[PDB]
Amino acid sequence: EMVDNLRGKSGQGYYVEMTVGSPPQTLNILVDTGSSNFAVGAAPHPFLHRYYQRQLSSTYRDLRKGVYVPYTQGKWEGELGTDLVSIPHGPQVTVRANIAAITESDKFFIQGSNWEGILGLAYAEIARPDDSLEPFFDSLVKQTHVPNLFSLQLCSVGGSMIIGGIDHSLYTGSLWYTPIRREWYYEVIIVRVEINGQDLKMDCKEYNYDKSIVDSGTTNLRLPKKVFEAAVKSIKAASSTEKFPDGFWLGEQLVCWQAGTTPWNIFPVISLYLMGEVTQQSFRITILPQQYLRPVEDVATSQDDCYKFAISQSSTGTVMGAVIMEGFYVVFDRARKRIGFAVSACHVHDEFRTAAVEGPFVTLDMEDCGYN
Ligand SMILES: CCn1cc2c3c(cc(C(=O)N[C@@H](Cc4ccccc4)C(O)(O)CNC4CCOCC4)cc31)N(C)S(=O)(=O)CC2
Which of 14, 125, 220, 341 could form a disulfide with 184 if both were Cys (CB 3.0 to 4.6 A apart)? Predict the structure, then answer.
């Protein structure tokens, strides 16, 4: 009953239906493994179709404390409180959780996105104002019998969030696990990067400067500058049969082809090798251009198919965003401090190539790839 409980629009996040308050007020909430605050629109905004009305909830409790949360894109401020929360197409339970009632925001809500709030699924360590503000998933686990794990199958878009377990109908092949290095963001270690099978040949610490994370709330694969530049050079070289404006590689301009003629085969596969559970072992996840060239729907341009380059630069380390998670079944196994990856039932592939999760791989180099 939890399958296909996620919806969204390409590039604008995936959301799950939730209710807050008594009587229940239904809101669509973006699923975000890259933050740890549960927050909902709580005042009128041009891009909000609806919002949380605290005055109408008898179970609402004001904590008399403001909070401000900045993201890479957007920011908001609001009032902290607690109230009853349920998930209609998730586990049938009711929990009392912290909620930030957003009363002011800047470049956060997105014109026509269909969500009104955000569910930060990361750990308390990064919650605002501080780690004493217990995150929603922690409250869910403490107050119910739900196992300490969830999984995300991100595929107008759709997908599934399976709370408390693993749904085997959602993936094929093996689940490979990489350790969660530190419990704040979902931090992992990348040990190797290849572009069409060619190693970027970089000290692996560069891939994890200064942390690498799995972040469903960020669209792009975001890379440290040194890695971004090397990857772009390699993708340019592989695709050199066609030349694109510099602005494209900067995500500042679309590339378009006549409908149905997108030359997928001139763009390389990208393989990210993640640290395994055993010393000097790794596995790789392989990303097709259908993932990192993100479709931009626009009827005005619809004689063509157009795309944005969904790999970009970061000054805070690697962010494996939605375009990386798409077509993989990703298990956030908090109980065992590990992240699992498998090919999902909605995997990306054409008749020549396919997204993959494969291992084991071994390196003789004993260096630890963690930056700190
Ligand atoms: C979904 C809307 N959206 C589109 C883009 C893009 C983007 C970044 C973000 C972004 O900051 N995501 C927020 C959640 C959020 C979701 C919807 C609207 C606003 C915010 C987060 O919590 O997940 C960040 N997590 C941290 C990131 C840094 O490392 C620590 C964790 C969102 C983006 N980029 C900067 S991008 O992907 O490069 C360009 C496009």
Answer: 125
Resolution of the coordinates, Å? 1.8
Q: What residues flank ligand 1, with Cβ below 6 Å?
A: 11-13, 30, 32, 34-35, 71-74, 108, 185, 213, 215, 217-220, 222, 312, 316, 319, 321
**Spatial distance between the Cα atoms of 91 and 140, rounded to a whole number of angstroms:** 10
Distance from the Cα of residue 309 to its chain's centroid: 17
> To 10 degrees, the CA torsion angle through 252, 254, 255, 260?
160
CA distance 304 to 92: 45
For the record, the structure tokens of 202 come out as 């970089």
Pairing of strands 94-106, 311-314: unpaired
Here the tokens at position 317 are 């380390």
Domain 147-372 in the same topology as domain 14-146: yes
Q: Which method, experimentally, gave rise to this model? A: X-ray
Terminal C-alpha separation, the chain: 42
Catalytic-residue membership of 210: no
Ligand 1 mean position, distance from CA 217 (Å):
5
Say whether the peptide bond before residue 44 is cis (omega within 30 degrees of 0). no
* 215, 245, 371 from 30: Cα distances, Å: 12, 33, 30
Q: Which of 83, 138, 215, 333 is catalytic?
A: 215
Q: For residue 189, report the distance from its CA to the centre of ligand 1, in Å.
A: 20
Superfamily in which the 14-146 domain is placed by CATH: Acid Proteases (2.40.70.10)
In this structure, CATH architecture of domain 147-372: Beta Barrel (2.40)
Name the strands in the sheet holding 304-309, side by side, starting at the edge strand that comes first in the sequence. Answer: 255-258, 304-309, 293-295
3 within 8 A of 169, measured Cβ to Cβ = yes
Domain boundaries, the chain: 14-146, 147-372
Tell me whether residue 368 is one of the annotated catalytic residues.
no
Q: Tell me: cis bond preceding 210? Omega within 30 of 0 counts.
A: yes
Contacts of 17 (CB under 8 A, 6+ apart): 5, 26, 27, 28, 29, 87, 88, 89
The residues facing 82 across adjacent strands are 61, 98
